[PDB]
Amino acid sequence: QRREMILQAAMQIALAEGFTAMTVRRIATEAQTSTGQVHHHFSSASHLKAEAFLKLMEQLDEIEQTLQTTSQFQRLFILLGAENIDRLQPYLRLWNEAELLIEQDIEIQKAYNLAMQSWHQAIVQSIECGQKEGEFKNRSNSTDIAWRLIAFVCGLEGIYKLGLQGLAEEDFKRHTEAIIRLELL
Amino acid sequence: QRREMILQAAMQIALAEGFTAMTVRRIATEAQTSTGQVHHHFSSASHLKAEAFLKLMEQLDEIEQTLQTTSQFQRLFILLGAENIDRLQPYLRLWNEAELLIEQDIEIQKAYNLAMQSWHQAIVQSIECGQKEGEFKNRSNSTDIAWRLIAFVCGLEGIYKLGLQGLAEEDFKRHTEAIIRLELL
């Protein structure tokens, strides 16, 4: 589990300071091990960053599954980021940071796509559960709706980054609710 | 109109080769003028690039208004990029190129936002015309729907750029049609 303890040290630095601080020197110091042992367990510094990122993203999904919901409508708001739980703010800060690194880090590029597919599958699962429970309609198939919901929230957050003048960031929940309602009721 | 002829030369280089080729030396040669006259008429090389970009974007809207449509449903597909007119491919190539430059060019940053607002207002106008003509419903206000439609298509195209494995780019029209139908019928 000494490899796991190195990973846990990288995850702490990632959550608190981001990817650039995640040098092998720093991680070895934090895990109280040698840089030689970090290199033994991980093929590259970028492999370690991506593996810690994926662990933190799996951890984000775990945390999200402990918020109490009564409906799949509620769980969709959480999965789509419309509820801004304060616990998850450093997790989302890392996610946005990873999004910028996929254009210069091959391992982070692959890990980001794996996390995207995991996110899509968690939305599919919530949609299909809501349909099975009688809460959601099924005018379109669940895979199509999930990609459209992800596309919407990523696009809306992309437009917020522009700093446009007639667009209030505080409307994100209201817009996301409207789209969820139109797609599923 | 000698200033206008310099602008037209910059627009030709922009459409054919992109922003990096738009040096003052190159534009002066193409407009058959002196670099001194280019500097007289334009405050900076980046001012010239942004002014030519905005002219080409206004030109894209003009071209789009000449495609014959029978419904506002059809015009929305065109405005949202779902119909891939071959004429507009170099215009859209420049638009995506500008999107990358807003993080290092202050004038392109401002011009891109102006074009975004112009795009939003053209969608608002189409929505409100379709509602006035009896073709569209009005469950939400036209400004809200327009931002959501722009957010969707930008988000969908952003997800296409990732190179995910279970996502077919050829589905863009089908997804955009579904969202238009849900928002407006």
Author numbering:
A (entry chain A), B (entry chain A): 8 to 192
Would you copy out the relevant sentences from the publication that reported this structure?
The polyamine-binding protein AmvR regulates the multidrug efflux pump AmvA, which is pivotal for transporting polyamines, an abundant and prevalent class of amino acid-derived metabolites. AmvA abundance in vivo is transcriptionally regulated by AmvR, a TetR/AcrR-like regulator that senses cellular polyamine levels and enables the dynamic modulation of amvA expression in response to fluctuating growth conditions. The overall fold change observed in AmvR is characteristic of the TetR/AcrR family of transcription factors and consists of an all-helical regulatory domain (α1–α9). The AmvR protein can be further divided into two subdomains in each protomer: the N-terminal DNA-binding domain (DBD) and the C-terminal ligand-binding domain (LBD).
To understand AmvR’s response mechanism to polyamine, we first determined the crystal structure of an AmvR protein derived from A. baumannii at a resolution of 1.88 Å. A single AmvR polypeptide chain is situated within the asymmetric unit of the crystal and forms a homodimer structure with its corresponding partner in another crystallographic lattice, which is consistent with the results of size-exclusion chromatography. Dimerization occurs primarily through hydrophobic interactions between helices α8 and α9 within the LBD. The second and third helices of the DNA-binding domain exhibit a classical helix-turn-helix (HTH) motif, with the recognition helices (α2) playing a pivotal role in sequence-specific DNA binding and being separated by 55.6 Å in dimeric form (measured as the distance between main-chain carbon atoms of His46). Although the majority of ligand-free and DNA-bound TetR/AcrR-like regulators exhibit distances ranging from 35 to 41 Å, suiting the space between the half-sites in the operator, apo AmvR displays longer distances similar to those usually observed in the ligand-bound state. In its ligand-free state, the DNA-binding domains of the AmvR dimer adopt a dimeric arrangement, maintaining their association, but exhibiting a long distance between the two DNA recognition helices, similar to the arrangement observed in the ligand-bound state. Therefore, we speculated that AmvR may have different states in solution, including apo-state and ligand-bound state, but we only captured one state in the crystal.
